[PDB]
Structure formats: C-alpha cells, structure tokens
Design a protein around this nucleic acid. Structure first.
Length: 290
DNA sequence: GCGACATAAAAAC
DNA sequence: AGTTTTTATGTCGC
C-alpha cells in the first residue's frame, strides 16, 4: 500500500496510490522525491572573457512533491501541487571567483548579463508545450501566475529535508535561518572588491536567488490527460538554464528585460523528466469512489 | 469535465 | 495550549 525509498539525506519518499489510500493534505507523506532528470542537450558555449576558459555547466534539479512512483510509472494529480527545485553548478569555477569575472557566449561574443532558469511542461510524445500555473499559499484567495524566469548564481541543491522545512515559513527568526541557503544579497558585499563589468553587478536585482524554487505548481486546468484512444498522455517537466543577454541562429526565448527593453534568454543546457502520467478529476482517481 | 466554494486534517506558530 | 495556515479533496452547478 505504501512503498518506501530512502532519499539521499536519510528522509523517506513514501509512494502511494491516491486511488487506494487517502492521506491528509499536510502529512509529511505528501513530500517525496519525484522522477530523476536526464540531459536533453547542451546549447551555447560560455567562455570567461580574458582567459577564454570554457565554463562547465550542470543543472541540478529535483522534484520534492506531487509525483509517485507507481508500478514503474511516475504519476501526478491534475488537482494537486508539485514542487520543482533547481540550482546549477560550474565545476571549474568557485562562486567567489565566478561573481568577479565576466563571461561571453561563443556563438562572435555576446556578453552574459546573468544566468537564469526557467521551467516548462511538454507533451513528451509530440513536444507540444503545456501551460503551468502557480498559486500562492492562499490559493484561490490569492493570485494565479505562470512560472517565471529565475536569475540564479551557482549553488549546491538543498537536501529534500531542507526544501520541506522551508516550504511554509513566515516566522522571521526561522526565515533568517534559511536566508543564506536561498539568497545572495548583493547589497551586503564589499563593492570595492568588484569591477564595474563583474557578473555580480549585471544581475537585475540586489536579492539574487541561489535556488530556483517552484512550489504550488500545477498543470493548467485545461489539460487533457488522456489521448482519444483512452491511453494516458505522457508529459515531461523541463528545466532550462540560460544566459540573459542584450539583443542589440541559436535557441533562445525573448524576455522582459530590466531596463524595459527586450532581452534574450539564450539556452545553455536543458534537462527533462521521463514520461509522466497525470490523473484527472474523475471520481475513479480517488479512494473516495471505492 | 471544469470554475467555484466547502470541508477537513496536520503543520506552523 | 489554543488559533491560524495550508492544501488534498468533496461537492455543486452548468
């Protein structure tokens, strides 16, 4: 009925089928590690502007809520939240050095303003994009929004337990405890240590995330979860690492820039999950029907 | 099948 | 120790 796997940090993931077992909304059993991500591809190379050294990049993503491993399928529920977190790392550059340096895209060199992550959902069989929506903790009593592009600096990915613990913090003392895990406050560095052209100082805001945390995420309410044949559709969640550049023949998305103009989010690397099944609102997807 | 509102149970404080 | 918050899901109306 409940199948248990030990996570990397010694917490457990407890996989259960909501058709058969109903668990309380805030039970820790609702937190669990989802499917592992795989490389789709690498895109534009990035080099350090004097040394010419290629920057090694790696996305480090994880799902922490919303998906169960049931009979060799990964299963989510249309009505319920998932959590997708990600960092990236630069194997050949320590953070402190990285932030003082400057980097170009090797297309012929566009200057990188900052690095950022976005997420997408797709139909895994035909590559059609599927809309994602997020809520605040207030859900229907607050606004709905689409996942945003998240500027980030390189960081290790927090353990599953840390993401759990930080999911619904309001208390100022507890917020302070987690601040250094999730944020870099540029306004607190010694500005004299940095050149005008340094990467740190081309990030758009002073508060810079170390971790992209997409919580309270759902597939859009309009998604059809079954094919006409009544077979389940297969979905996939994608994480894309990009370099944001000034636009003034490679994969990119347009982005609302900080100075008002049209920025370009140039793709660097993309990872995706294996195929995902999503259970819809049918009564037969719930233990209450039995 | 979906937008909307109701219930309810453990976390958070 | 009690109150408020958060989120899975139950249900109503079209």
């Amino acid at each position: 009925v409940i199948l248990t796997q030990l996570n990397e940090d010694g917490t457990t993931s407890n996989y259960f089928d909501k058709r058969k077992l109903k668990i309380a909304p805030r039970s820790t059993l609702q937190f669990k590690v989802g499917p592992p991500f795989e490389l789709v591809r690498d895109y534009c190379p990035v080099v350090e502007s004097h040394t010419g050294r290629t920057l090694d990049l790696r996305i480090i993503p994880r799902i922490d809520r919303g998906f169960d491993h049931i009979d060799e399928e990964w299963v989510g529920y249309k009505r319920n939240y998932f959590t997708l977190v990600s960092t990236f790392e630069t194997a050949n550059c320590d953070l402190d050095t990285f932030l003082k340096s400057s980097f170009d895209l090797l297309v012929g060199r566009l200057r990188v303003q900052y690095f950022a992550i976005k997420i997408k959902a797709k139909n895994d069989d035909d590559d059609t994009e599927i809309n994602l929506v997020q809520h605040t903790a207030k859900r229907d009593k607050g606004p709905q929004f689409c996942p945003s592009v998240c500027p980030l600096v390189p960081s290790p990915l927090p353990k599953h337990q840390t993401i759990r613990e930080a999911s619904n913090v309001r208390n100022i003392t507890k917020m302070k405890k987690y601040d250094s895990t999730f944020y870099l406050h540029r306004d607190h560095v010694n500005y004299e240590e940095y050149g005008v052209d340094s990467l740190l100082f081309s990030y758009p805001e002073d508060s810079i995330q170390k971790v992209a945390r997409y919580e309270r995420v759902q597939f859009a309410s309009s998604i059809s979860v079954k094919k006409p044949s009544q077979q389940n559709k297969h979905f996939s969640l994608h994480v894309i690492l990009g370099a944001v550049v000034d636009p003034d023949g490679i994969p990119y998305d347009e982005l609302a820039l900080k100075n008002g103009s049209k920025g370009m989010f140039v793709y660097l690397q993309e990872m995706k999950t294996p195929p995902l099944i999503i259970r819809g609102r049918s009564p037969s997807n719930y233990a209450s029907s039995q």
